[PDB]
Amino acid sequence: QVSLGVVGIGKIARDQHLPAIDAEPGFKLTACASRHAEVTGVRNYRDLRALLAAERELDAVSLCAPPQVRYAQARAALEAGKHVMLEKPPGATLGEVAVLEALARERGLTLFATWHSRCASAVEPAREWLATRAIRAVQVRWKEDVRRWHPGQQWIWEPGGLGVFDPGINALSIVTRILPRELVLREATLIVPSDVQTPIAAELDCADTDGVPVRAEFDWRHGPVEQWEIAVDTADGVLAISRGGAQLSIAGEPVELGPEREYPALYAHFHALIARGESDVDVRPLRLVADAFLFGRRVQTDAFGR
Amino acid sequence: QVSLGVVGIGKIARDQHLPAIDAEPGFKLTACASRHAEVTGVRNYRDLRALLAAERELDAVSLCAPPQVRYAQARAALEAGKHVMLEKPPGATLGEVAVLEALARERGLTLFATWHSRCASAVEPAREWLATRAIRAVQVRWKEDVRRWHPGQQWIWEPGGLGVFDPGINALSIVTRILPRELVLREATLIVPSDVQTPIAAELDCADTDGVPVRAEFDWRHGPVEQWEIAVDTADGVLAISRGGAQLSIAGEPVELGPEREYPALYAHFHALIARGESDVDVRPLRLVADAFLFGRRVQTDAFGR
Ligand SMILES: NC(=O)c1ccc[n+]([C@@H]2O[C@H](COP(=O)([O-])OP(=O)(O)OC[C@H]3O[C@@H](n4cnc5c(N)ncnc54)[C@H](OP(=O)(O)O)[C@@H]3O)[C@@H](O)[C@H]2O)c1
Ligand SMILES: NC(=O)c1ccc[n+]([C@@H]2O[C@H](COP(=O)([O-])OP(=O)(O)OC[C@H]3O[C@@H](n4cnc5c(N)ncnc54)[C@H](OP(=O)(O)O)[C@@H]3O)[C@@H](O)[C@H]2O)c1
């Protein structure tokens, strides 16, 4: 049993992390760090530094806080000799993560940048279907009401919070896993409300290296349709991922899929990486987003307001 | 003796590229591509695709055009079997540069992402002196009036053109060569005029992996003093680079250096890279600018004039 600590007991820690952990006998939940929350049945600390000082035999740490505080938490846990699992996005910058990964490597420690939507049930069968085939186009639609799905949340609007790319990077994490060739950004448009620091919507125009166009529209504004779809057009028909990876159809037939166990799968993968002395740090979805922030044209819109 | 083609005969090609090539026996200037200019004594083409179709025995290509068109040109040159030298920034995005690097390896071709300010005479002496001293803090000041130094240039203000980071990235390419440890961006502020798509001023708060603060101020606005300095505080005194890397002082005492031969040295390195069969693609200065566009707070400022 690998001794596990968890940092930042908020929405996703209680909804997904704690249940999955308790159902991984491969980890044993030992301690938690959170400023304004406590988890019963374990030792609890206010911050990770006080956890690391007191939990000398702790093996591993999993970061469930916002991405603007991940680098300092990941760095401290690796200093103290712990394996590290990162919620997504793996950091607020690319430079952060490169340093974390060199640091983990240097100490033989496991660093896991997680992309939970990559563990959706449609991803692996769609990747197998798409390996050989000739692809013609990809389109992504990722639209939801931020007020309905992130009520009152602030850090999403602060520097390093990604804005609409916080769920949008999920779709990019699927796209980059299911297509075989790499993506280049050709053009992007970011749409930023004048009272926040991150985009509320974006359109992305990419191409993979054989020139296959990949288009994506991200939108958090009130709208008629909430959708989480990726549609790959091929000589052999259309592969259509919907419901955020939980549903798949190939050429117009449903594919039977095992039920959704994203976070169970991630923790099983984190436990296997520790067992093999390995790391899994794929930052390509973040790199694409960075390219959008670096290369995209930016447009001002009406205030998000209250 | 390498057969060479130059694309984009504008200001830097006239000012530095062509006279460096002419004084480098390693290269024979064979052909130029430019839509609105012609070079004497060589075959000239309106664009690179035409040049590649008639220049069969050509070996290598140097790209001197704006960054937004660098990818399509470099990929074509690499796909036609030519070594490629990139002006800086090596691209408008990180993803496009990773694609070029991978493509040149697959073909065995040399790809050289150049940074002319890394060849300034102060850089290597400064790198040598700093390699194992105790560094306390680093300060960077890169300030000049764009109306004086870049008059009538417009691609600097378009997406992918970097704005004040076009000269700013030069400083970043020196800091990143002379400091032994990697940089993490902790905070950035970008000052963007309402009528352009790139910033005219920026502040970066960085730290190296030992915790050394690295601060940089970039400014293209009207101000008191032009300056292009990198000052490094150590327990053994201050190392100060000034005049864009042409001047170096150590503990108040100047150090005397080779005359400025930045592009002669860039082209000597390119030839040597082709001799060895290697590439040189250091995108760290660009990755850091991308972290600032991603993570930085943005402030709209008054219209620049255009
Ligand atoms: N549907 C989802 O929500 C979802 C799904 C998948 C992945 N994620 C990812 O998981 C992360 C956050 O989603 P969320 O549920 O965790 O939002 P969250 O509830 O706002 O953040 C989780 C907790 O981190 C702590 N926190 C906030 N600021 C902190 C700071 N400066 N220092 C230390 N701790 C701080 C807070 O707990 P304390 O106040 O007690 O310290 C917060 O309760 C994000 O990276 C997100 O993209 C979310
Ligand atoms: N000037 C400096 O201070 C300086 C110094 C060192 C390095 N650099 C770097 O060198 C690169 C070029 O800089 P520059 O100062 O020479 O800019 P520039 O004066 O605009 O010259 C670039 C030339 O590329 C061609 N061009 C412009 N748009 C093009 C397009 N869509 N497609 C094809 N060709 C196009 C143009 O030649 P045609 O119109 O004839 O086709 C232009 O004359 C930049 O990446 C810059 O960062 C600049």
UniProtKB/Swiss-Prot annotation, chains A, B:
It holds the Pfam family GFO_IDH_MocA. NADP(+) binds at residues 12, 34-35, 166. Changing residue 166 to A: Loss of activity. Keywords: Arabinose catabolism, Carbohydrate metabolism, NAD, NADP, Oxidoreductase. Changing residue 170 to A: Decrease by 4 orders of magnitude in catalytic efficiency. One of its GO terms (biological process) is L-arabinose catabolic process to 2-oxoglutarate. The keyword Ribosomal protein does not apply. It catalyses: alpha-L-arabinopyanose + NAD(+) = L-arabinono-1,4-lactone + NADH + H(+); alpha-L-arabinopyanose + NADP(+) = L-arabinono-1,4-lactone + NADPH + H(+); D-galactose + NAD(+) = D-galactono-1,4-lactone + NADH + H(+); D-galactose + NADP(+) = D-galactono-1,5-lactone + NADPH + H(+). It comes from the Bacteria. The active site is at 88 (proton donor). One of its GO terms (molecular function) is galactose 1-dehydrogenase activity. It is an enzyme of class 1 (oxidoreductase). Its EC number is 1.1.1.376, 1.1.1.120, 1.1.1.48. Pathway: Carbohydrate degradation; L-arabinose degradation via L-arabinono-1,4-lactone pathway. The keyword Transcription regulation does not apply. Disruption phenotype: Cells lacking this gene do not grow on L-arabinose as a sole carbon source but grow on D-galactose, D-xylose or D-glucose at the same growth rate as the wild-type strain. SUPFAM superfamilies: NAD(P)-binding Rossmann-fold domains. Induction: Induced by L-arabinose but not by D-galactose, D-xylose and D-glucose. Catalyzes the NAD(P)(+)-dependent conversion of L-arabinose to L-arabino-gamma-lactone. Is involved in a degradation pathway of L-arabinose that allows A.brasilense to grow on L-arabinose as a sole carbon source. Prefers NADP(+) to NAD(+) as electron acceptor. Displays high catalytic efficiency for both L-arabinose and D-galactose in vitro. However, the enzyme appears to be involved in the metabolism of L-arabinose but not D-galactose in vivo. Monomer. Belongs to the Gfo/Idh/MocA family. PANTHER family: BCDNA.GH03377 (PTHR43818), DEHYDROGENASE (PTHR43818:SF7). This is L-arabinose 1-dehydrogenase (NAD(P)(+)). It comes from Azospirillum brasilense. The lineage of its organism: Bacteria, Pseudomonadati, Pseudomonadota, Alphaproteobacteria, Rhodospirillales. The gene is araA.
